[PDB]
Amino acid sequence: VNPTVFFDIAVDGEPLGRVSFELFADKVPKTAENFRALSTGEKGFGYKGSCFHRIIPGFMCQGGDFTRHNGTGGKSIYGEKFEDENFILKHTGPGILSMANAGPNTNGSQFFICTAKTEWLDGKHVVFGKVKEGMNIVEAMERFGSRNGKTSKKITIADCGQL
Amino acid sequence: SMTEYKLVVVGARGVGKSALTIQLIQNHFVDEYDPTIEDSYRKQVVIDGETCLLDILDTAGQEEYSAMRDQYMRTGEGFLCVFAINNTKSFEDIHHYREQIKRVKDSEDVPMVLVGNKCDLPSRTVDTKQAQDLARSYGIPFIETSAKTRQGVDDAFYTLVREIRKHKEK
Ligand SMILES: CCn1c(-c2cc(N3CCN(C4CC4)CC3)cnc2[C@H](C)OC)c2c3cc(ccc31)-c1csc(n1)C[C@H](NC(=O)[C@H]1[C@@H]3COC[C@@H]31)C(=O)N1CCC[C@H](N1)C(=O)OCC(C)(C)C2
Ligand SMILES: Nc1nc2c(ncn2[C@@H]2O[C@H](COP(=O)(O)OP(=O)(O)NP(=O)(O)O)[C@@H](O)[C@H]2O)c(=O)[nH]1
Ligand SMILES: [Mg+2]
Structure with missing residues (x-):
């Protein structure tokens, strides 16, 4: 069975709501396991307390920099970065969960949640999950974004874990 | 009142477009790489004893969006064309940016400056003479920089x- 994880989202420290994700361990086990472990914090580090630093309405919400908290950082459970596992799954629509990167084989911890189909990212970003519950929370996050992604309020993962 | 100049910083990803702009505006530098979506800044300066307002567009070098540059090229008045002196591919990318700018603005006379950035680094792969010769063939200045x-x-x-x-005073 594919694991499911949750984020409790907060806006300037005020709770907004919970988003849950199915992680496609049946197709991308290494990538799903990284996200799962970072969501539980079981390695001593992970997503709890980190923010969504880039939110672009019409496109995606991006987060996961828990090392520097400025969009430049993050790290995986395997080392600073790990390879692109496969590109079997595509960016088919809102709710897709996919890895951010800085080019081939640079997956760390940063990720993005699609709010639209982003097919030109197919074959460049590893898709590894999708929103299960709480898509309305992701939609509610979009109004805190902007054209270039800078956010107007601090959007954080106040808590996270495995269900 | 003072004159505003619409400057656009272009070049391959990672060459230092943002670091140069941030040094200009904020007087600092960090080794961390925060890739640009699109950023805009304003700064007043004095140039040849004449105060003016720089409107600076810091563009994305991410090449997958190369088809999305026409509008900012039409709007921009002058272009800082940046490559890194330790990255030969970014120097090769310069020709394509310049040809794109000339094609979009439909002019052979577009204000531009060739910028060889990262001149603090020992691993130089683009000779100064190589860049000076190109800038001369373009009819534009060349400046070596380090953000x-x-x-x-x-x-x-x-x-x-x-x-x-x-x-403008031509
Ligand atoms: C040209 C402007 N522009 C656009 C864009 C494009 C479009 N289209 C393209 C598609 N067309 C259809 C075919 C017809 C329609 C018009 C419209 N309007 C826009 C924006 C709003 O105009 C301002 C984008 C976009 C993306 C980048 C740069 C400029 C961009 C960019 C820079 S770096 C990167 N992308 C990958 C990035 N890397 C890092 O963050 C590294 C940090 C350090 O190391 C870890 C971590 C990363 O993984 N992601 C995770 C994935 C989404 C991605 N960010 C991101 O933000 O995409 C933003 C956006 C809006 C989705 C795309
Ligand atoms: N040594 C050195 N490093 C530099 C210099 N300019 C930029 N860098 C480094 O090069 C990396 C990329 O710089 P950045 O300014 O983000 O480049 P960019 O052209 O804006 N990239 P993008 O097109 O993705 O926005 C960063 O790690 C930055 O610290 C420089 O003059 N010297
Ligand atoms: Mg930049």
């Missing part, structure tokens, strides 16, 4: 303003 040491930062932007002034 890390601040070498040439003011000079690169101020020179681009001077180029725009010549074009």
